[PDB]
Nucleic acid binder design. Structure first.
Ligand SMILES: [Zn+2]
Ligand SMILES: [Zn+2]
Ligand SMILES: [Zn+2]
Lengths: 287, 18, 57, 114, 69, 1226, 111
RNA sequence: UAAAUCGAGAG
DNA sequence: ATACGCTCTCTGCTTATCGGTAG
DNA sequence: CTACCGATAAGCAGATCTCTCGATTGCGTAT
């Protein structure tokens, strides 16, 4: 699925104590299996809870979420495991984690549901709430953009730009914008945590394919929350992994380099008048 | 009791007592 | 008391809307008669809903 | 509910304008190991929404409108066959709104019912 | 939900022609117009009262709370 | 409000002054200490935010007063701040007067000669002698400076003495908009140049530059922080030295109190806690959420305790002193920021809790939500449903409202006939009472009472009072809203004044919806698809008078936007007119008599003869017939008053003379001597049209007779349509085979329109193939440019519109299978009951070209309009040319384009009302007080004269309609002469002098006008400028008199010329705007409401946000700017074909230009205004409150906005005078 | 943003749109438009693309819009001529409609 | 008994 | 178990650093 | 020669109809 992919992408959070340049015990901690089941309820041996009861109880239709951790030490000396629950996670009806996933319309009537009840909506405190679909930029597409907001980013900015909303296999998106400056210097911009960050693009070009990576890693070493164990080169390659075109991922350095080369050429066309801005209002560039 | 219907709003002495 | 549309698209029954009636067929007279409907109002027969037309809960 | 804090019987009331009929009651219990007493009740009432004058009715073409009067059947026009139409819609709605869908739908509806 | 006792427009009692209409459509191969006519429904006001009824109460009767499912 | 409780004292004015610490400590009922609101067990902690002595709190008798929760007004406490801290309101004032000084000399860094010069200039502006000060500047070693100062002081004192001795300015100054403007300019230049002194002049030693990084902190540089007590002491010394110079910078009216202005006002020595009544906790069942003000005060109290403890620790006594000093400094800064947060919720550092300023700043503040627009009592709301049999001046109140709404009628000796039986009825038996308000003010209730006791109470309504003190008053009964009462009906949004009228109430028996007659549809712009509207029920006789007389539905026939009518029957009655007044309409004796009595029932007063009169049958043999013309004639004869002739009128309608047959004359309408002799009643006659029959009846017999005529015409046309129907069908929409063949053959000529137009725009040969790659390439180059495609979108659109017109002309009204008047679609379209020719064209011929913002359908990046069409489809079909009609249906691509156009229309319709309402709000806030004085000169509330003559002639636009309809006036000369009755209009009016001067100036003008306007020396004023048009007969405007003279000189025709001109001039004397008319409000509505329908942005470039006014003002002056303003604010209205009376554009331009500049209608213009409360109630309440309180401004409560805020009667219309009663005894 | 656009030909329902503030924004989908919910197996697409003549990006030495860029799912695959671009675009459509999923959305932006 | 924020609607 | 610490507009104005002119 | 007054160039603040419903209203930690 995708929860497991996402939590695999999350990784570890290494914190070192100060007990005796060796920091001590590594404590590499992560999660490896995230799973849900049908919503049961103990009322010794657990029975089943059906959305008819959830609606009539004025309560939520929530199952149990189980995360199994990886409480490791010293890079694998002892790896304790723990399958901890995560409370009542609401589950949407007619879905493979709901008690009515395959019930026939006769069976649906049998459990007080309806003849042709449709799912798609969660039940929360007995109120039926769905999660409205949204429309966003098309994924993995370097689209020319000319918006005046870029010109307001400061001095020497042009309203021109090349934007992309990359999406990782776990279906989470990171944005990248190559701004064009009046000087002729292009400028990568992203938002790693919540604030804008700008980097010259030739820097990232040479860094993707150790002098720059240490240089680049030293810039973002603190905001990325890299542990003291990780070297600056490691955090630099991690930056080139977790920001630059996360739709190529690891084992994609050369591919990301070619992609950024292409984006630079596209920007040069867009500022030279050989191509037109792509409307994000249109449906031609939307998902 | 003792409202604008039943008491003067402002009662002054025109001159000194006589 | 719902009713099936006499006039209905083919998709009306692909989606099984007949499981959920929405209105009722009524004898509509396009006529300037009572004077109580000019802009957008409309006139409803009294004895029609005295016998259950358009009733709901 | 007889209350321990005051030892006096207190009753809740109906906070609504439209008189209602008690349709159903659900004595919701709590799934706790203790024999916790009944505390949550879901009372559902029905109220009869007989069409009054002023209720918006609409066709499938956007001819929304309130009902000005429930015109008695004797006073409505009657055809040769003797049927008084249940809905009278003023003709002037169509020339500007241009809903010929309603005209053709009325035609097809009479043809289908015949 | 259930068949109306009377036709709304005219007032003719059509509260008994429902099962008969179903039979005449089912027991005998009849078109809808033929069955409606053979029951005594010539005015289109009476014809639409039975022609287009859904009889939803059947779907309402499955959910009986007084009988074990 | 009770009429039997009289109030003597009235607030003359208020003045904005700073409260001082010493004053607070004297009034306060207690000072609060601990930052705990209330301790456990439920009681409030003594000394906390709540207390017994800050107001009775939740069943706790107040200690301060000794009265319960209801009878304790609340009392004010204070917080002893340990240290004085900045007041965030005045931080910019404190930060300008903190700089611009020498810290050693303790003067300003400006030479005292300049400081004294500004002081005397501002003292002269205190008294209004603006020009005298400009000569004061015209005065031009150190011992001579003292003499120069003394000379200036003598000059100023002597000018003041002369002005006060001349009867020009009293002891309290003369403050107005212009003197305020010059004072503001002077002070701003004062401050701008006061910071220009980087080095002191009294002792030329440099000083540090104070640099403020943000509020709550100020830093010095040679960086270094400076304590607040240092700033207070510094500015205290500076103000002590320059008290004489700041006494005239912080004041505008003479400080008769002579109280010195300190620097203590600029600092928060004490915080003031409002009475507990104003911070009561949010109670929601069990939830109790304490006030945000209580939380902020708790925070400040906590900071006070902490900083006091740090101070005490420092008092009980190196490194420990270092840490305690750092902590004490941070306690100072934190309590400063917490005070700044308790006052303002956006200067802080840290979503944030609302501050006391935030309760006022914008909408939903205390000004635009609880003072301007309140929430009213004794009112109702519902949904409107139509109802004929309602008299067009009535509204149908449902029984629910009719039993809820009540009116307090005091019982008299003449009312106990009906109020006794109203009490006997009870609160449910309509009509009846719900309460008895006794002599003692006690409100005895009837809701929970028995009928026996109710009658027993009724038997004592009119008893004598056994109280020596209440002998004046008498009991009141709160009767149900009876049939005689009046109700102010409004329907939001109120785009114009006519949307809030006053109706007489009819108590319908049946249903819960406000039933309203059809005529008022355009007046409220209402429909009946669930529109909701509100009824307000006034509670005193003086309020009944205005809705019954001034806002009465009869008084509202003509909209002041142009004087046009916006009444008249709308949809069914119009077509019933096109049919009933046909030639084919013949009526037997029974039918005609029933139709006549069906609408003019003389049992309530429909007709003015008390016995219906008939008319002789039009066709005698074989049997007595009639005509619809005769029906109209006898209806008019019955409704029109007796002892007066009938109307005479010649006009037209919208139905040509071809739609009735060859040689027909029904298109021209003729009324002769009260009889309808020709022409069909239409939309033009009765409806939203000017100069028709109903308009003429309005102008001749009065407005009430026109209202009765509207009621009877509605009733008659209804009773005629309920005996004869009128229906639209599917055959009405059809065309013959001839028409269809013509339509097809013309539309086949639209096949090559697109290619030829495209080749034309790109300038190639017309005979080039659609596949020619050159044409494709040139269209592609056109594709990216937004203007080359603009001219490719304009020429083709014209061609397809022309082909549309060709189809429409050749098809209709010829090809249609059913012809007029059989074709009910055309019958209701030509007549004007609904729709246009374009609608029946689209229904029968074609939709046409779809417009999306002036251009054609938006195109893809490929060069395709739609996926179905090839790249650059050289065919008008792809562009958006919808050939299909709503009768035959339209193709999917055309359906898509029609969806595009409809969505665009919905978007703009959503935009227009909201976008264009802000401009109307701006205008209405500015021109709220601009009314008509008794000099017939329009001026603001204060008095700053805006214009001298309304529009130049002082003619009311609601009475200007038939002033230049001379032929109409002559035809109905006798009726008008009867209506004016000059018998009693000459015993108190002069004629000879005004007529003489008018003749003299007319002769002088005819002697002149050979030469252009500049050379035309007047030597002779216009009569209006010299003579009062409402007091001297014949005082009339130049253009009116000239047009009347031209009419009398081209039409030489028992009426003579002298009597006709006497009648016309008397009519002009009665067609003058009455004194006290809110001409500003009317102008604002009449310029904003029609603006709903280049366009609105152009308005914003002229009214709100400053050919070009700037160029014409900078070159040609102020009057040229006014003329340009009027011309441009008119021709945009003209292009939309809305008639806009120039008595509005002139008033707008003359209010904008009142300062000689181009004052737009934004906050910049409003800043130059005398009353503070208007500016506070408009926007930026903080800045205007600061400016009001720093000048100790005492606004005189004249603006409409201010008089509401302080609870006094308005200064327009009914309040623009007093009323005093004559008493017989001495 | 709120304007109806021709790019929504069968994806957004033109007539279906709320009236007022949300107009042009709270759209609805055409009843036959099905939004994809899982990944298409494009791992085998380069193989057929290489047979057609899509020269790999590692060994082509190409740049600019002057040449067509063949890309999959957001990563550059190769660079080919424009005419070859038309040929392979239409050919891939032929094969996929007639290994290759049915959700393979092919967009060939021509010069 | 409140008041805010988000959402849904009526004209 | 709970009480206490907390990255989409338009009109102005105000501040600012570079110009001279005139004793 | 310096001081004082303009002058855009940049930065900054406040703004862009009534009415009915519904739901929800805090983590976090050191005891
Ligand atoms: Zn029937
Ligand atoms: Zn008190
Ligand atoms: Zn000094």
């Amino acid at each position: 699925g995708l929860l497991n992919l996402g939590v695999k992408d999350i990784g570890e959070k290494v914190i070192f104590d100060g007990k005796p340049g060796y920091l001590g015990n590594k404590l590499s901690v992560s999660v490896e299996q995230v799973s849900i089941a049908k919503p049961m309820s103990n009322d010794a041996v657990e029975r089943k809870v059906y959305p008819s009861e959830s609606r009539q109880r004025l309560t939520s239709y929530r199952g149990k979420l189980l995360l199994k951790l990886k409480w490791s030490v010293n890079n694998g000396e002892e790896n304790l495991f723990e399958v901890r629950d995560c409370g009542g996670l609401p589950v949407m009806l007619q879905s493979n984690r709901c008690h009515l996933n395959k019930m026939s319309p006769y069976e649906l009537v049998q459990h007080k549901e309806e003849s042709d009840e449709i799912g798609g909506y969660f039940i929360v405190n007995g109120i039926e709430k769905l999660i409205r679909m949204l429309i966003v930029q098309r994924r993995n597409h370097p689209m020319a953009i000319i918006r005046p907001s870029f010109a307001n980013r400061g001095a020497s900015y042009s309203h021109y730009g090349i934007q992309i909303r990359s999406v990782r296999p776990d279906q989470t998106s990171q944005t990248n914008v190559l701004h064009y400056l009046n000087d002729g210097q292009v400028t990568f911009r992203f938002s790693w945590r919540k604030n804008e960050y700008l980097v010259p693009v030739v820097m990232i070009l040479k860094a993707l394919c150790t002098q720059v990576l240490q240089y680049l890693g030293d810039k973002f070493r603190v905001v990325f929350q890299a542990s003291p164990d990780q070297s600056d080169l490691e955090v630099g390659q991690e930056v080139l992994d977790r920001i630059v075109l996360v739709h190529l991922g690891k084992d994609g350095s050369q591919d990301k380099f070619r992609m950024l080369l292409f984006m630079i050429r596209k920007l040069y066309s867009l500022v030279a008048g050989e191509c037109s801005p792509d409307n994000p209002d249109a449906t031609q560039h939307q998902e | 009791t003792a409202t604008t219907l039943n008491t003067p709003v402002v009662i002054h002495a025109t001159q000194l007592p006589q | 008391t719902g009713q099936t549309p006499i006039v209905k698209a083919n998709l009306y029954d692909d989606y099984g809307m007949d499981n959920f009636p929405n209105g009722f067929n009524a004898v509509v007279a396009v006529i300037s008669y009572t004077g109580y409907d000019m802009d957008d109002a409309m006139i409803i027969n009294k004895s029609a809903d005295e016998r259950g037309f358009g009733y709901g809960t | 509910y007889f209350d321990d804090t005051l030892n006096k019987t207190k009753i809740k009331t109906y906070h609504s304008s439209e008189p209602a009929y008690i349709e159903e009651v659900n004595l919701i219990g709590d799934e706790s190991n203790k024999f916790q007493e009944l505390q949550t009740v879901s009372i559902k009432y029905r109220i009869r929404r007989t069409p009054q004058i002023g209720d918006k009715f609409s066709s499938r073409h956007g001819q929304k409108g309130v009902c000005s009067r429930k015109w008695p059947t004797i006073d409505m026009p009657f055809s040769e066959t003797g049927i008084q139409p249940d809905i009278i819609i003023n003709p002037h709605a169509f020339p500007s709104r241009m809903t010929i869908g309603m005209f053709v739908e009325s035609l097809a509806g009479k043809a289908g019912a015949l | 939900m259930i068949v109306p006792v009377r036709c709304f427009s005219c007032g003719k009692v059509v509260g008994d022609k429902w099962e008969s209409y179903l039979n005449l459509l089912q027991e005998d191969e009849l078109d809808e117009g033929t069955a409606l006519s053979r029951l005594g429904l010539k005015r289109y006001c009476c014809r639409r009262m039975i022609l287009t009824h859904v009889d939803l109460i059947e779907k309402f009767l499955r959910y009986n709370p007084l009988e074990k499912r | 409000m009770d009429i039997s409780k009289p109030v003597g004292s009235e607030i003359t004015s208020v003045d904005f002054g700073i409260l001082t610490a010493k004053e607070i400590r004297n009034l306060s009922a207690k000072q609060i200490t601990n930052p705990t609101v209330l301790d456990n067990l439920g009681h409030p902690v003594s000394g906390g935010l709540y207390d017994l002595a800050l107001g009775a709190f939740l069943r706790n008798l107040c200690s301060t007063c000794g009265l319960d929760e209801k009878f304790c007004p609340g009392h004010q406490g204070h917080i002893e701040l340990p240290v004085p801290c900045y007041n965030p309101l005045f931080f910019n004032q404190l930060y300008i007067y903190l700089r611009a000084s020498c810290l050693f000399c303790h003067h300003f860094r400006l030479k005292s000669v300049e400081v004294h010069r500004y002081a005397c200039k501002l003292r002269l502006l205190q008294y209004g002698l603006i020009d005298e000060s400009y000569k004061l500047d015209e005065i031009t070693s150190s011992t001579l400076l003292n003499e120069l100062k003394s000379k200036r002081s003598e000059y100023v004192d002597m000018a003041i003495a002369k002005a006060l001795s001349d009867g020009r300015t009293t002891e309290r100054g003369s403050f107005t908009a212009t003197v305020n403007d010059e004072r503001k300019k002077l002070v701003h230049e004062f401050h701008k140049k006061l910071l220009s002194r980087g080095k002191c002049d009294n002792c030329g030693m440099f000083s540090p530059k104070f640099r403020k990084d943000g509020f709550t902190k100020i830093f010095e540089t040679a960086s270094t922080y400076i304590l607040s007590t240092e700033v207070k002491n510094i500015l205290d010394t500076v103000f002590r030295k320059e008290q004489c110079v700041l006494q005239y910078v912080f004041h505008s009216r003479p400080n008769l109190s002579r109280k010195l202005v300190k620097a203590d006002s600029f600092f928060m020595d004490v915080l003031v806690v409002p009475p507990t009544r104003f911070r009561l906790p949010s109670k929601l069942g069990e939830e109790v959420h304490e006030n945000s003000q209580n939380q902020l005060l708790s925070k400040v109290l906590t900071t006070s305790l902490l900083i006091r403890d740090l101070n005490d620790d420092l008092s009980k006594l190196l490194e420990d002193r270092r840490v305690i000093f750092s902590r004490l400094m941070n306690a100072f800064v934190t309590i400063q920021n917490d005070v700044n947060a308790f006052i303002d919720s956006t200067k802080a550092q840290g979503v944030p809790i609302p501050g006391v300023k935030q309760a006022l700043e914008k909408k939903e503040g205390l000004f635009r939500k609880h003072m301007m627009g309140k929430r009213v009592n004794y009112a109702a709301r519902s949904v409107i449903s139509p109802d004929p049999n309602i008299e067009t001046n009535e509204i149908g109140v449902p029984p629910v409202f009719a039993v809820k709404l009540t009116y307090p009628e005091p019982v008299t000796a003449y009312n106990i006939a009906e109020l006794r039986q109203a009490v006997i009825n009870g609160p449910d038996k309509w009509p009846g009472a719900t309460q008895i308000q006794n002599e003692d003010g006690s409100l005895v209730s009837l809701i929970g009472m028995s009928v026996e006791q109710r009658k027993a109470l009724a038997n004592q309504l009119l008893t004598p009072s056994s109280n020596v003190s209440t002998h004046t008053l008498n009991k009141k009964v709160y009767r149900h809203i009876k049939n005689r009462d009046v109700v102010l009906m409004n329907r939001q949004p109120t785009l114009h004044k006519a949307s809030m009228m006053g109706h007489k109430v009819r108590v319908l028996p049946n249903e819960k919806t406000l039933r309203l007659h059809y005529a008022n549809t355009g007046a409220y712009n209402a429909d009946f698809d669930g529109d909701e509207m509100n009824m307000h029920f006034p509670q005193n006789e003086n309020a009944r008078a205005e809705a019954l007389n001034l806002a009465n539905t009869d008084s509202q026939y003509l909209t002041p936007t142009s004087g046009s009518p916006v009444r008249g029957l709308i949809q069914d009655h119009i077509s019933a007119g096109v049919w009933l007044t046909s030639k084919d309409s013949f009526f037997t004796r029974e039918q005609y008599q029933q139709y006549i009595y069906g609408c003019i029932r003389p049992e309530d007063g429909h007709t003015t003869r008390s016995k219906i009169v008939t008319l002789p049958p039009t066709i005698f043999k074989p049997y007595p017939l009639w005509t619809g013309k005769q029906i109209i004639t006898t209806v008019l004869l019955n409704v029109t008053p007796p002892d007066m002739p009938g109307i005479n009128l010649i006009s037209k309608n919208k139905i040509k003379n071809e739609y009735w047959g060859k040689g027909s004359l029904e298109n021209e309408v003729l009324f002769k001597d009260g009889a309808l002799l020709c022409g069909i009643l239409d939309k033009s006659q009765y409806g939203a049209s000017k100069y028709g029959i109903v308009h003429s009846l309005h102008e001749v017999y009065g407005p009430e007779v026109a209202a009765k005529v509207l009621s009877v015409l509605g009733r008659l046309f209804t009773n005629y349509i309920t005996a004869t129907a009128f229906t639209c069908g599917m055959d009405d929409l059809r065309l013959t085979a001839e028409g269809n063949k013509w339509r097809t053959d013309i539309l086949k000529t639209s096949v090559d329109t697109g290619r030829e137009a495209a080749a034309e725009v790109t300038n190639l040969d017309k005979d080039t193939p659609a596949d020619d790659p050159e044409l494709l390439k040139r269209l592609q180059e056109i594709l990216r440019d937004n203007n080359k495609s603009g001219i490719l979108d304009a020429v083709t659109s014209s061609k397809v519109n022309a082909i549309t017109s060709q189809v429409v002309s050749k098809c209709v009204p010829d090809g249609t299978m059913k012809k007029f008047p059989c074709n009910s679609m055309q019958a209701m379209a030509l007549s004007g009951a609904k729709g246009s020719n374009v609608n029946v064209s689209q229904i029968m011929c074609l939709l046409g070209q779809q417009a999306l913002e002036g251009r054609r359908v938006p195109v893809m990046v490929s060069g395709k309009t739609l996926p179905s069409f090839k790249p650059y489809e050289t065919d008008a079909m792809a562009g958006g040319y919808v050939k299909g009609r709503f009768y035959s249906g339209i193709k999917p691509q055309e359906y898509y384009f029609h969806c595009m156009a409809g969505r665009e229309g919905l978007i703009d319709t959503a935009v227009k009302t909201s976008r264009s309402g802000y401009l109307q709000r701006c205008l209405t806030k500015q021109l709220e007080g601009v009314h008509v004085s008794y000099d017939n000169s329009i001026r603001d509330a204060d008095g700053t004269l805006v214009q001298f003559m309304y529009g130049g002639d002082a003619i009311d636009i609601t009475k200007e309609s038939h002033m230049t309809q001379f032929e109409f006036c002559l035809d109905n000369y006798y009726a008008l002469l009867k209506k004016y009755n000059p018998s009693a209009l000459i015993e108190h009016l002069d004629v000879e002098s005004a007529l003489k001067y008018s003749k003299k100036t007319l002769k002088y003008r005819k002697k002149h006008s050979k030469e252009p306007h500049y050379k035309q020396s007047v030597k002779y004023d216009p009569v209006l400028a010299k003579y009062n048009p409402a007091k001297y007969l014949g005082s009339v405007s130049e253009n009116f008199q000239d047009k009347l003279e031209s009419f009398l000189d081209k039409n030489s025709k028992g009426v003579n010329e002298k009597k006709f001109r006497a009648l016309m001039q008397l009519k002009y004397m009665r067609s003058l705007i009455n004194p006290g008319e809110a001409v500003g409000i009317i102008a604002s509505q009449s310029v904003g409401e029609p603006s709903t329908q280049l366009g609105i942005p152009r308005l914003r470039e002229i009214v709100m946000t400053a050919n070009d006014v700037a160029a014409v003002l900078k070159t040609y002056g102020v009057e040229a700017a006014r003329n340009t303003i009027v011309n441009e604010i008119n021709n945009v209205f003209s292009r939309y074909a809305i008639s806009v009376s120039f008595r509005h554009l002139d008033l707008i331009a003359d209010m904008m230009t009142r300062q000689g500049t181009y004052l737009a209608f934004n906050r910049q213009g409003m800043e130059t205004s005398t009353s503070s409360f208007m500016k506070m109630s408009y926007e930026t309440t903080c800045q205007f409150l600061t400016k009001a309180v720093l000048d100790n401004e005492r606004e005189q409560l004249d603006s409409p906005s201010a008089r509401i805020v302080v609870g006094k009667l308005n200064n327009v219309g009914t309040g623009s005078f007093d009323v005093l009663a004559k008493v017989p005894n001495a | 943003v709120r304007k109806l656009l021709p790019e929504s030909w069968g994806f957004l329902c033109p007539v279906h749109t709320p009236d007022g503030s949300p107009c042009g924004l709270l759209n609805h989908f055409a009843h036959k438009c099905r939004i994809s919910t899982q990944q298409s197996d494009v791992s085998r697409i380069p193989s057929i693309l290489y047979s057609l003549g899509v020269a790999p990006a590692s060994h082509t030495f190409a740049a600019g819009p002057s040449l067509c860029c063949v890309q999959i799912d957001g990563k550059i695959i190769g660079w080919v001529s424009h005419e070859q671009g038309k040929i392979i675009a239409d050919t891939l459509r032929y094969w996929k409609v007639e290994g290759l999923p049915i959700d393979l959305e092919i967009g060939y932006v021509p010069p």
